[PDB]
Amino acid sequence: CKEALAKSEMNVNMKYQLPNFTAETPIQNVILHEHHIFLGATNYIYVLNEEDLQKVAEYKTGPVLEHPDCFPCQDCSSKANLVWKDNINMALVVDTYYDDQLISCGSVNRGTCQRHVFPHNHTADIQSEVHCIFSPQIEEPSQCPDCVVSALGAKVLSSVKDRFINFFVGNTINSSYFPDHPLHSISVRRLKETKDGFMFLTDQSYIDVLPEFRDSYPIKYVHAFESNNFIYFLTVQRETLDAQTFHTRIIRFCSINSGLHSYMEMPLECILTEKRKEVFNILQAAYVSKPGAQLARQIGASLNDDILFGVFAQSKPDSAEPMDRSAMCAFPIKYVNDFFNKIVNKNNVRCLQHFYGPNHEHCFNRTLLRNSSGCEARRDEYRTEFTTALQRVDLFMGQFSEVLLTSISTFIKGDLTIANLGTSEGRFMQVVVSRSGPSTPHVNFLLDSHPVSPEVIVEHTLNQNGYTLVITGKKITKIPLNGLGCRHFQSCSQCLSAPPFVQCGWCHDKCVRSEECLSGTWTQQICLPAIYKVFPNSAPLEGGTRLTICGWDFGFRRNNKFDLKKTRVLLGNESCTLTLSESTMNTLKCTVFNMSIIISNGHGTTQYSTFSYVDPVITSISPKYGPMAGGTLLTLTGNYLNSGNSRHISIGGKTCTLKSVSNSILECYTPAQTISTEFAVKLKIDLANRETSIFSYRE
Amino acid sequence: KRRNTIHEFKKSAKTTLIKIDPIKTKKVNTADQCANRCTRNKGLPFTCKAFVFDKARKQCLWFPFNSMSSGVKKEFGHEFDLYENKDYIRNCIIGKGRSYKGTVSITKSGIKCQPWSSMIPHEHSFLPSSYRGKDLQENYCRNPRGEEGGPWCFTSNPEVRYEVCDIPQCSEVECMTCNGESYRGLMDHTESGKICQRWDHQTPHRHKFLPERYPDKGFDDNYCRNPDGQPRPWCYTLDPHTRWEYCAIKTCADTTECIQGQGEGYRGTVNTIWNGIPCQRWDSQYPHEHDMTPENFENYCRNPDGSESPWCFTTDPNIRVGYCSQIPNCDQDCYRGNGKNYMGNLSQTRSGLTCSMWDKNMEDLHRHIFWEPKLNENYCRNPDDDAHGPWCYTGNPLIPWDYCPISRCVVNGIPTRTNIGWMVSLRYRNKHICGGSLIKESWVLTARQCFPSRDLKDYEAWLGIHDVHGRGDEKCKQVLNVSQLVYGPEGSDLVLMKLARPAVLDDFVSTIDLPNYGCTIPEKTSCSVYGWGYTGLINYDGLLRVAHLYIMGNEKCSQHHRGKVTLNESEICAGAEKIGSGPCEGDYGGPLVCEQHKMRMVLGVIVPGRGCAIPNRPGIFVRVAYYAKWIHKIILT
């Protein structure tokens, strides 16, 4: 039996009270700074304590009244007419290069942002200072400089380059709203020292789709980061202007204050390939971090070589949504940089579809000096679109291929690395990552109905004090990365599979920390076999029948595998038969006066005192007379008739249809025979041949 | 019914045809429907040998002639696309060759074919009127009935009536290589005689390969390709029921340790994975059968499918694929500011140019400078022990030498009473942006952060003005184009401009002397800065505005920054007199000038950073003396 022992695996649901805070409105972004965590949520902003998990203060960008004549920060309080919209923060950043500043951004106010200051004595007040970054472009009102945040999609990266604050923003915008307000899909806003506006340094400082396709070609930006003086963007789009399919891409460009000079895009796919193929199209979340040492060997990198981890989900047929099927895939920065620079040949390179246009003179007769130029800024830049994609394999080998992962974060501990997966339902988990094999989730509990937001914050001071901040629906939670407990482990195998940093050990009854054994028998090296049930408990020393053994921890404890060859089963001196095909670490099969059974796995042994030496016997039948057609119930009696699995009761080679079998009474109906005389009945318990009282036919 | 036959046509991109001595256009949405019309019998009264469509035109036009027809002009028209009938191009036999249009009119016996219009010497020549659209030409032999024998014609020879023309099959010319992907030929027929559907189409198979998405692999109309690395090319079947079929082609006739690429072309006798588990041979399917076979292309770690790493099936049955990741793939100074200490194996410059011929380099260096009486030709090593790092001479006539990139360890403005010619107003887009300092008759310096553009035909220099655009003195203002700009050393963030023509000196305009290279500044030394830029006033009349500045050391700046900045010898700190006043936007590249005793001289350059003049907070400027020797070296040009 397998389901009867469902107590084997870790109890997937057990409730914990974590440091948590509830929001009145959905939360969009999160920022940590100086033991203060800032939460931009629907129309609101909050400040939260790092340890206390208490709202220090809050401020409202509440329900927004809009007037067509009204400008984003011009006074409009006296307006008695109008829309009643709601601002939500897609772009939130803390900057410290100039001063301790928060740049927040609302969705409705023409995508205009606001600036807030902190006093030194009190580094948490935000209502003290409010500052619109709203510079009237009297020079060229054709382009709105401070109109930055697109209401449809926004991804913002702030950085400090050449002693200026630079904002690389990728904005998804529909063609409908373009004439209302001119925006650019990808732009670089550089901060004025006066902190009152931005300047577009040149025309080539921005790149955006040609107007005709601004309805088609949906480009949604999902991540951005910086490495090796490059700004990378992970974003989804169609395969081509015609495909209507979807696939994600990496975008790199050189961060010169002027604008994007060397603009490259390359398509990324992650595939589950087996011997003698599932491709994940849509990226769900991403996170770049330093790798684990074992992972450093497994991927060929150093402890400082930065690796990007992406959650990829297969797209719906000609649609951007997934089928709730997700995987995690790793990409070293060195390999992707080299693929961009050297590996791809010349003729595969193409011109940008949405920017250049197929019927235009550049990619007619323009080429690249790929091998002889890298990040070089030339005024007649050539925007490139590689057609050769980069493929990688899921390191989990599809351990989550049936479920969707909504978010992901990573951290490391000694030689190993642990990923903080977030499930579409909101089932946060932590799992050790390794190419060795699938990893059991040492924590799997369900948090909330709402999905886990892609906004996730990690922190680990001193490699001792660690915790992650996770948003979900209207609640944020601080989950320490030091584990929660060892009690939930319900098998020695599961208990020992736990990472060393959580002190898990079987205390002869259940897994627990070392100090918590009253009995002092804490163990972390051996798995004593445990018997759940035996089917059945009676067999002769020669009688042989199918024997099912339900239990746990039968297999030899190896690092990942659990072998059955390193196990013996004995009926005292006699050894019970081993059927390794039907015998597992969980279940076993044998086919052989109360007696005990000793099962010795690769580490320990256990005795089961229920087996008995009996033999079925027969006393009488009823009745003795029956017609030619048969069909007569034989109230067969005896003892040990319920030992062993099966009984064959037949007369003249034709089965007496068995209706009921018990230890004391047996019943069968005779079939229609061919002669009418005095015959006996034959019983089989698969080895114990037994004859009974003769039964006479009539006609 | 309603059928499709463009799958039998060819296709060309961005082309159109014009016959000088000739054909009708109709508005049709689908060019495929037009091609079907052209094939469909009686559809066009003429013999539609080709078709042309333009999506922009949405116009459909058939040509009764091929591209091979004499007197036609090909025009490279992006919007127009050509669809040619491959039968005239086939020049071979498929099956019975029912629709054969070959321009062959000879028999195996070499007697000329009897014309199909003249019924002598044999009278079975009513077929030109019997069968419409079958394209039996004046004399060329066809298969009007699609008879199994092939193209047969009547002989003008009397004794023999008709004989089948010997015309080759199509498999004769199309050979095959083991890889298959390299092959790109003319077969468009599957192994069972089916025809490959249009790779541009999406019906009746909604496959994955998109020819524009995946170019470079011959994803043409219907010609067989090997995209998935099969031993043979295959194509999706025109039949909706048959998913895809292979293409029958006869075969053609007539290693290291380091890793190149991802191991595709690489072969290696090593077959041990990082786990150390070896791998079995390709013949031995043990433990679990592997699809790949040697006939498709030992027990080594190869890459038949061209994955990221070569993979060989581990002897362990549980692991299907193991990757030998231990393979190696074929793929700077500190505290030594003098390049003589390190032998830099670098033939490149910071700008990316290669070096020059070191013989003439040594000759010119010795002639120019005789500092001291070795190194290798064309390398990062330098003889002069330059503090800014190793460098190398360059062959560029404009610049003969460049550094080799190896890592080694006004707010509250008071207007000026008079005008000073040391300032240069950076004019781009016909307006001031930044301030520059005049060193020579043809040399200015400013900050690197004042150049949105890397070109020069847009910038402009305006000199000798007391106002923003010289609103006062139009009599003496001067305009000069920029001839060259040069970026400073690593982290210097300074640029040197030589103008299109040196400006003759005058009382107003002034060139400025340079600091002593080893000089140091005393604390609190008052100096002056000049600017046209932002001042915070309600109205900037554009007049030159002056401010006074005072030196402070690393400390008071650092506590004023509260540890924000860790200062360096490349930097000079100086702040105001506890009042709110300092450089801001529009003043970048402005000069800080000071005197030893009487002769005033530039010590600093206004650089953007850390806000505009926060009261009681000193500003940071470059050390001009940190580069004075380098400027003296570059002045040789």
Numbering used by the authors:
A (entry chain B): 26 to 107, 111 to 304, 311 to 626, 634 to 740
B (entry chain A): 34 to 55, 59 to 290, 302 to 344, 351 to 384, 389 to 430, 434 to 469, 495 to 722
Publication passage describing the model:
The reconstruction of particles from the first class reached 4.8 Å resolution and showed an asymmetric holo-complex, comprising two c-MET and two HGF molecules (denoted as c-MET I, c-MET II, HGF I, and HGF II). All six domains of HGF I (N, K1–K4, and SPH) showed well-defined densities in the cryo-EM map of holo-complex; however, only K4 and SPH domains of HGF II were resolved, suggesting that the first four domains of HGF II are less tightly bound at the receptor and thus become flexible. The overall structure of the 2:2 c-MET/HGF holo-complex has an asymmetric “Π” shape. The top part of the Π is composed of the SEMA domains of two c-METs as well as two HGFs; while the lower part of the Π exclusively consists of the IPT1 and IPT2 domains of two c-METs. The distance between the two IPT2 domains of c-METs in this structure is ~20 Å, hinting that the two membrane-proximal IPT4 domains of c-METs are likely to be positioned in proximity in this specific dimeric conformation that allows the intracellular KDs to undergo trans-autophosphorylation. Strikingly, in the active structure of the c-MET/HGF dimeric complex, only HGF I simultaneously recruits two c-METs by using two distinct surfaces localized on the opposite sides of this HGF. HGF II, however, only engages c-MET II through the interaction between HGF-SPH and c-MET-SEMA; thus, the second HGF is not directly involved in the c-MET activation. In the structure of 2:2 c-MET/HGF holo-complex, both c-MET I and II assume nearly identical “9”-shaped conformation. Our cryo-EM map of holo-complex shows strong elongated density peaks between the IPT1 domain of c-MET II and N domain of HGF I that can be assigned to heparin, based on the size and shape of the density as well as the local chemical environment. First, our model shows that a heparin molecule is sandwiched between the N domain of HGF I and the IPT1 domain of c-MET II, and acts as a “glue” to hold these two domains together.
